[PDB]
């Protein structure tokens, strides 16, 4: 689901 991509991106870009 394309609509889930930015959540993944947000999660991996946290520190």
């Amino acid at each position: 689901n394309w609509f889930d991509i930015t959540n993944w991106l947000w999660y991996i870009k946290k520190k």
Partner: antibody, heavy 124, light 109 residues
Framework: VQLVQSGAEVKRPGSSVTVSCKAS????????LSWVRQAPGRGLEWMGG????????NYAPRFQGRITITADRSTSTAYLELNSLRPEDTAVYYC??????????????????WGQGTLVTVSS | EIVLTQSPGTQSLSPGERATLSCRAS???????LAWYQQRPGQAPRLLIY???SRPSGVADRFSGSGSGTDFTLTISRLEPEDFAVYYC?????????FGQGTKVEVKR
């Protein structure tokens, strides 16, 4: 987050239209920006969207072959191009960006932020 | 393509009354990614509910969403004058997002 679209335009049948959507506030590159249209007296129709950082587009099958959605990170502007215009394409075109939840910027997918719309009239 | 059915397409109700609006999907909606929007004439749509039941901070708590799978409902606990408007559901549980055709909540007299 405020989305500001380019102004109304009249386009001839068979031509191509480009509509712009400039975002101010928050981050541009990591949130999904979609285009949704509404023909006169009709409902909302999702056309497609882009995730700028990744350059990943996602088009509705109905528009796949006629649409291009692009993002310019230097100006926080997204663009909709729609080709081969027909009178049925007369509509208000909205850009719509996904919302966030909490304080950490977590995206929600659903469209919290909407531009003012752009009326594209296809006519001779 | 998931078809979202909003039936009835119009509800005639009085101010102060409760409203329940149905959105039925032709297939199960992935992870209950179902949103509701309000739209008044001449205005852009506005997000009321996302993820079937979550409500953004700014949105009046008289709006609530419920349901899962193929069977979703927007509830307006008590209709205020500004609530008479059109309501759209939208699924985004797969890459092809779709909207319902809308339900107009209008004033019965």
């Amino acid at each position: 987050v405020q989305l500001v679209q380019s102004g109304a335009e009249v386009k001839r049948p068979g031509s191509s239209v480009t509509v712009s959507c400039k975002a101010s506030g928050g981050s541009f590159s990591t949130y999904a920006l979609s285009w949704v249209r509404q023909a006169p007296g009709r409902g909302l129709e999702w056309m497609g969207g882009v995730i700028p950082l990744l350059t990943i587009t996602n088009y509705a099958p109905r528009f796949q072959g006629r649409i291009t959605i692009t993002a310019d990170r230097s100006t926080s502007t997204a663009y909709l191009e729609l080709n081969s215009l027909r009178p049925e394409d007369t509509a208000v075109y909205y850009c719509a960006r996904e919302g966030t939840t909490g304080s950490g910027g977590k995206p929600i997918g659903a469209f919290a932020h909407w531009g003012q719309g752009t009326l594209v009239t296809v006519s001779s | 393509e998931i078809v979202l059915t909003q039936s009835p397409g119009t509800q005639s109700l009085s101010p102060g009354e409760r409203a329940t609006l149905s959105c039925r999907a032709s297939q199960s909606v992935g992870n209950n990614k179902l949103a509701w929007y309000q739209q008044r004439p001449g205005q852009a749509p506005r997000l009321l509910i996302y993820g079937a039941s979550s409500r953004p901070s700014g949105v009046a708590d008289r709006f609530s969403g419920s349901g899962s799978g193929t069977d979703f409902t927007l509830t307006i606990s008590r209709l205020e004058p500004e609530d008479f408007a059109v309501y759209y559901c939208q699924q985004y549980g797969q890459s092809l997002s779709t909207f319902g055709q809308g339900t107009k909540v209008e004033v019965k007299r």
